[PDB]
């Protein structure tokens, strides 16, 4: 009853926390990228102004900024993967519950009409077809009526055909 | 008597649940396809702009999107198969009852 | 490859069509059995009446 709303609230709060933390990490990555671009432009400017040991310091500063940027980017990616895991687990649980409902419905239907009942019904159909064929063959036998004269006048009717011809 | 309506209601509710879940899965597949098309166009654009390691990242992103799309598609197909099983079982039960009635008459 | 999928889809549709067609034919055969049994019973009753008269 009320527990379902509590579960939904807990999942939403966990997603909110994870997304907020990812927002902080993206903000820090943006700041690091800003600093790295500023540092690259500054290094180019002072190399225009003629200094190279300072340029070594500048490229070292850009390198450490790039390293920190990469680390925060990977942390944000991991948080994204865990958000995806939460969503995938919720969807999978709902799908399994739907499949279980369908399985319950089909199980009740198959209990009502089993395969044994189907084979019994078809056996009854074939047996009644046999019986109806027996009755229908009894009443339609030409030897009862059509063959009145079985006499050997096949020669005689041949002669009458010759007469007509 | 009244149990027949309850059975019909239960079957209809089960079909509604399965179709709703299939609707969510089709929506997710549509979103994945949207992302994959966006990613392909983006990769072509930045290869126009001259980068290839980024293109490796882009094709990896498209590959994982395609994998997720395939998985949700197969799940939707399985849900469709189970809906078909429910419908086939209902039709088969009705057919068997009709055949039994005819057998009783004959 | 999509054409392989399409021909597979058509094949399963054809299989389901054949199955429902055979089920309909069996139902037709049972309807025919009901009609034949009614006609045969009426014919036997008529023959019995004639036999009684003769």
Author numbering:
A (entry chain A): 4 to 168
B (entry chain A): 4 to 109
C (entry chain A): 56 to 109
Excerpt from the paper describing this PDB structure:
To aid these processes, cells from across the tree of life use a conserved family of polymer-forming endosomal sorting complex required for transport III (ESCRT-III) proteins that deform, cut, and repair membranes (1–3). Individual ESCRT-III proteins are small and have a simple set of α helices (α1 to α5) that define the functional core of the protein. The most stripped-down version of the ESCRT-III system is found in Asgard archaea, the closest prokaryotic relatives of eukaryotes, which have as few as two ESCRT-III homologs. We show that Asgard ESCRT-IIIB assembles into parallel arrays on planar membranes to initiate membrane deformation, from where it recruits ESCRT-IIIA to generate composite polymers.
However, after mixing the protein with large unilamellar vesicles (LUVs) containing 40 mol % of the negatively charged lipid 1,2-dioleoyl-sn-glycero-3-phospho-l-serine (DOPS), long filaments were observed by cryo-EM. These filaments have a diameter of ~12 nm and are reminiscent of those formed by eukaryotic B-type ESCRT-III proteins. Filaments were also seen decorating and occasionally interacting with LUVs of various shapes, further suggesting that polymer nucleation is aided by the presence of membranes under these conditions. The polymers are composed of four protofilaments (blue, pink, green, and orange). (C) Top view of a cross section through the filament, highlighting the two protofilament pairs and the interprotofilament interactions through α1 and α4. A comparison with our off-membrane structure revealed a slightly smaller intersubunit distance in the membrane-bound protofilament (~3 nm versus 2.7 nm, respectively). This was accompanied by a change in the angle between helices α3 and α4 (off-membrane: 145°; on-membrane: 116°). Although the precise nature of Asgard cell membranes has yet to be determined, our data reveal a requirement for a critical concentration of ESCRT-IIIB protein to initiate polymer formation on reconstituted membranes. This likely reflects the need to form a stable five-subunit nucleus involving i to i + 4 interactions, which then extends by fast polymerization, as is the case for other cytoskeletal elements like actin.
